[PDB]
Amino acid sequence: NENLDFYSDFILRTGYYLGIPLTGPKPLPTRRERWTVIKSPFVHAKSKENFERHTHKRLIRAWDTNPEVLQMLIAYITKHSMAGVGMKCNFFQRSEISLDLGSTSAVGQKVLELLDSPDFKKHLEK
Amino acid sequence: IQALEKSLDELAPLMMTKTFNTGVAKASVIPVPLNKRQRNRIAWNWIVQSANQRVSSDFAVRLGEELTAIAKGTSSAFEKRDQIHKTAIAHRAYIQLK
Amino acid sequence: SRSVWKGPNIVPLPIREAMTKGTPIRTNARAATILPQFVGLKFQIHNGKEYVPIEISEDMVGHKLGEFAPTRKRFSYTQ
Amino acid sequence: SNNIKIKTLDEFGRSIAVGKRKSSTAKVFVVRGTGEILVNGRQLNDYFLKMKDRESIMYPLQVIESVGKYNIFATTSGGGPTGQAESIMHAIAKALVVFNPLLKSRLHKAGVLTRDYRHVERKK
Amino acid sequence: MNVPKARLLKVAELSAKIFDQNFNPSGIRTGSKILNERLKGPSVASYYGNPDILK
Amino acid sequence: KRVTPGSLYKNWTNTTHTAQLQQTAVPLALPIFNFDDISKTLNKVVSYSNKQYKSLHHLGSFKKSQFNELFQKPVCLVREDATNSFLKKLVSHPVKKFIITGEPGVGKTVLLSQAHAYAVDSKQIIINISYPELFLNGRNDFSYDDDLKLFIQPMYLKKLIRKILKANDPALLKSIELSKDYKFSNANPKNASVKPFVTLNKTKNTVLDLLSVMTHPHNRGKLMKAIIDELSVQSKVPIMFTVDNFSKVLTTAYSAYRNTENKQIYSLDLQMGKLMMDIISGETKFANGESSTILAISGVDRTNKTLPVALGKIPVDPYVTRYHYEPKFVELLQKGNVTEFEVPKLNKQEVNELIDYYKQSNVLLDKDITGKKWENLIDEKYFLSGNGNPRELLKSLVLSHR
Amino acid sequence: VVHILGKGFKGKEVIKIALASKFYGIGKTTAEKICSKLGLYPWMRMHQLSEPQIMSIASELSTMTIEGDARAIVKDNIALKRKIGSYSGMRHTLHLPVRGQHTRNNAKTARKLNKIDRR
Amino acid sequence: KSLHKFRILARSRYDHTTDIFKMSSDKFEHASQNARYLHDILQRLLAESKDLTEDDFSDVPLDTRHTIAKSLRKKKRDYEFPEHWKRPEDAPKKKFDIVDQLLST
RNA sequence: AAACUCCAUAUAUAUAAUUUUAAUUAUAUAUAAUUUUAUAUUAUUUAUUAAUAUAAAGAAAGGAAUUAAGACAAAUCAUAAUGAUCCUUAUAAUAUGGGUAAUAGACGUGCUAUAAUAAAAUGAUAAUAAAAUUAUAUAAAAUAUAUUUAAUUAUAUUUAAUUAAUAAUAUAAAACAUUUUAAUUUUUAAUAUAUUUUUUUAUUAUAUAUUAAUAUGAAUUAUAAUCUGAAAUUCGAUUAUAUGAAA
Ligand SMILES: Nc1ncnc2c1ncn2[C@@H]1O[C@H](COP(=O)(O)OP(=O)(O)OP(=O)(O)O)[C@@H](O)[C@H]1O
Ligand SMILES: [K+]
Ligand SMILES: [K+]
Ligand SMILES: [K+]
Ligand SMILES: [K+]
Ligand SMILES: [K+]
Ligand SMILES: [K+]
Ligand SMILES: [K+]
Ligand SMILES: [K+]
Ligand SMILES: [K+]
Ligand SMILES: [Mg+2]
Ligand SMILES: [Mg+2]
Ligand SMILES: [Mg+2]
Ligand SMILES: [Mg+2]
Ligand SMILES: [Mg+2]
Ligand SMILES: [Mg+2]
Ligand SMILES: [Mg+2]
Ligand SMILES: [Mg+2]
Ligand SMILES: [Mg+2]
Ligand SMILES: [Mg+2]
Ligand SMILES: [Mg+2]
Ligand SMILES: [Mg+2]
């Protein structure tokens, strides 16, 4: 949590100067992973050691901001990121119903090639 | 409920003789006092055993009948109590009192 | 039990030579499904150590070659 | 300084308290009334089938002899019927102290203001 | 449930067309699942690490 | 044998119902139920009359699991919001088609028993179907009738016809002269081998004679159609048709019976189902304008969208599977203009009256009488009963030894 | 006692249950179809049946593969396994499990029942 | 009429309770490609919904079974405090503090 | 060493524009107890005391980790690693098939069961959880078949949403209510009867065998179909009909 909280505080300061209304950091439920091992290398499966890993999570939300300013925020905080912190960003773009100019699998191709090869065409002959 | 508590207080033995493995020689049969929680257990088990000799398929019915007969005076577990008290009266001198 | 809709477990075998010459077919494909064509032909089926000679009848179609070449010896105790 | 601010009834005369038992939680709204109770919007006999669970909910009101003097709107989640019924019991006891703080000693003596700590323990 | 099956089949077919989905009213096994499964080769083949390490 | 003549061998629910445990109850003198003088009995516990008890026992108005064995005879609290309110609508409403609802144990069956008591007093003929499950569970014989194109159930019909005869005043039945001539096969073991058939001529024989016809099982379906037709054509006597536990009918569209193709038989293909739904839907119209149809649901049955939709409480959802929504029953109920009467829960004053009667009946434990203030008891029992549920009130008083 | 095709039944026994209990080859589903075909109501008991109805049950039972005929089909399928020399046939001959069960322990029921002339 | 046909053809992608039509695609390798794909489907669905020359599917009622299944997996706290239970006359009344009243002048 | 700690618990502050909603929550920080006080009694090293009770205050009742020494030259050279010694066309390496699943007896640990304080059905405005999982995926709803009105269960078809406090695995289950339940003539049926009517009573029929295995139990086995896989023969899982052992 320590680097996570410190970095979250830095993001809020960056956003303020950029003119971005920000909320958070909202703490999300911590995920706990668990692994149980047998301490001995060969036998003695009666003494088992416990290990765990906690994923700490924080949500910072941005409001009423233009896309260009939002990209500046992400670029700056990426340049000055801390060790052991990961970041996922969901962007929401409101658009018009009808746009201008808009916004085949490998297996299927091989099947067509295989069905044309002689080992298959020799049977499809009707 | 008052009938149940009266029946439990009349059927449960006040004391019970217990064998204590004291010394390499033969154990001693010394009368011991019983508390109310221990008294109720002895009397309840007697009631349940008597109840399970009745004809009803439902335990509640057999228990109800057994409790009604005990509240009306008739029960075969009063003999058990008299036999536990006879043994204790015989071993009255075996008590330690210190 | 292989699903019937998938078809038989067809394996590469030399059946043409065994039908024009009568030679036995030596194979390790114990999973192979005995097809109705095999009827009458002679097979030598591996059991892990030796090749068991077996001729296919009409009551063997659908079964698999491995079913007719036992791989273990009958158990016995030193009574 | 201290971290305790006097509890008082809200704008609608309601005393709000939270209670916990095992994995269950309960948030009750106690107001002066005539003994009407609602659990998660449902009648008490509907939500709690066991009469012993209903008797547990009533016990704090029975200690202060105020069973017909309050309306309870209880909301509960988590655990099972026993945890929820006793979590509501604990929350009603904590909400009744605002109406008369002189009865806290009697509620403590009855044992309804003590949070039950017992929970499922992973075998060690 | 009272909606005629013919009407519900017309909706299913048209809906499938709009959403580029495979409409197989009969239920014949088509193998479409095989064509849609993801390729796990790249992940499987990197189990032991990147082979182009400095030695 | 292990079972003696007086041994209690059944389970608890059947023992309490059948073991005649009311014999030891103390006789109390209570006012009698009379709707014409309800002003004197409103909000008071009353017993039924001797003429009402005889009829209601033959109709099946009193059921097991109603703690009836606590009292010398079954008693009822004449309520203003349930008993008086319902009986006034029954006397005033022009349609007179009702379905009684409410939460499990709220007192829907007792309300129906009070409507039966009113009908007995008001010189009406009561046709009650207490337990519809008996003709839907597949535990009695069934036969197909070609002339009716329905599956008739002779064993059940024999019991039902006797209940209609023994529960209703013979004088009322004798007043209804027959409108048509009827001929049936004779099953009377005295002259069956002498008289092939028994004829009932019009204007000479009455509906009382029709209810005493002993016929062969295969002709008993035609006897039930005649009885209903004769009672629906006459305009002299009002007919009160009642069905308790009607929720079972609404939620069991297909009986346990199977036809010759191992297909379960639709309930409306049974004469009992068809007859029941013909009276409810209005297909079978009664000439007398005071005839009523009172249905009651029970909490022992599963619930689904059938009844709520029929009553207009929820919108129709067409994609609900048939097992949870039967559109044919909804159509029949709405064609008959059946109206809902929800039985309200007891108020605290009604709880006080019931607990005051229980004290005089000597059914209250000593922990609720000694060392407890009367006001505290009423408040506690009103809280522990869910704020009015009569069944939870009785259980808190006589079936809570904790 | 009601006798259908030699089998004896206690009067109280439910017909659909009794048929699937005493007759080899008839189970719960098959018994229900027989009763549905003969117009017997779901929970009818044996003592209720008349002689015409007892004969109808025997007729429908005699048009099915039950008792010896059904048992012979199993004995002939097992014999075919031994005739072709399949691994399964040998297991039946050796009184050993034929469906992959371990034999280091247990395997007691296969030892008592697995045989070419299976009951 | 076109709104009804649109909702019928969306099937599980429409939630009547919230009125939201949501469809996602990750079939292509680039987000821009996937965005166009969803846009193109939206135009196709709108064109079919606005072409009521052959069929309008007005007889066909909206199917919500998918939404019902989702609702059963989320806990619904849909109960509010009864209004006739509120006792506004029992709320604490602000007391008069001369100091605060005098410190404001 | 103990403690000081960390967890749990209680409380306070901060964070969430309360639609990622569980605010009855999430998780950062801080506080709290190794509880405290008064009185009587019994002992004492009798005093500024312990054991006890009584009264008062309090949410306060549980845990983890916490290191030093020695032994069994206890297990492991088969998690990997080292010395010595041995193999080097083989004691190294690859492929196909087989084996590790054999079966007299014996032993350990489990599962299921041997019926009525207990098993089976049914319960849709859907009684009531927690902790986890889903990019080497979790799979909704719907439709089709088994299969019957439908539900249920299984599989196929199709692949909605979600790579997640959002969607899915997943409507927890027991509980509770109703019905049913062999042994059990304690039943069922036919008549009559009732102020027990889902029921009572009467008279007839309802079996014989039987220390015993039923409508308990589900081993074994026949046939058909399905799932995963390139492949289910030795040797996998599931379903249907039939089989129905021991106990
Ligand atoms: N008016 C009343 N006076 C006295 N007792 C009553 C009254 N109403 C109900 N009760 C009692 O309440 C209990 C339930 O009554 P009743 O059987 O009529 O309820 P119900 O709603 O029909 O039940 P279910 O949902 O099971 O069909 C019984 O013990 C009954 O005697
Ligand atoms: K059988
Ligand atoms: K084996
Ligand atoms: K063993
Ligand atoms: K909220
Ligand atoms: K192997
Ligand atoms: K059992
Ligand atoms: K759950
Ligand atoms: K058996
Ligand atoms: K296999
Ligand atoms: Mg009722
Ligand atoms: Mg998608
Ligand atoms: Mg589902
Ligand atoms: Mg060793
Ligand atoms: Mg091994
Ligand atoms: Mg729920
Ligand atoms: Mg599905
Ligand atoms: Mg979810
Ligand atoms: Mg449920
Ligand atoms: Mg269950
Ligand atoms: Mg069984
Ligand atoms: Mg035996």
Residue numbers in the entry:
A (entry chain J): 52 to 154, 180 to 202
B (entry chain G): 150 to 247
C (entry chain S): 9 to 87
D (entry chain I): 140 to 263
E (entry chain X): 1 to 55
F (entry chain W): 49 to 450
G (entry chain M): 2 to 120
H (entry chain Y): 214 to 318
Paper's wording?
The mitoribosome is essential for the intra-organellar translation of the 13 mtDNA encoded OXPHOS subunits in humans, directly supporting the formation of Complexes I, III, IV and V. Indeed, without intra-organellar translation, mitochondrial respiration cannot occur. METTL17 is a highly conserved mitochondrial matrix protein that has recently been linked to mitochondrial translation. Using comparative sequence analysis, mutagenesis, biochemistry and cryoelectron microscopy we show that METTL17 binds to the mitoribosomal small subunit during late assembly and harbors a previously unrecognized [Fe4S4]2+ cluster required for its stability. We then grouped particles from the two datasets and resolved the structures of the SSU, SSU-METTL17, and SSU-mtIF3 at an overall resolution of 2.3 Å, 2.6 Å, and 2.8 Å, respectively.
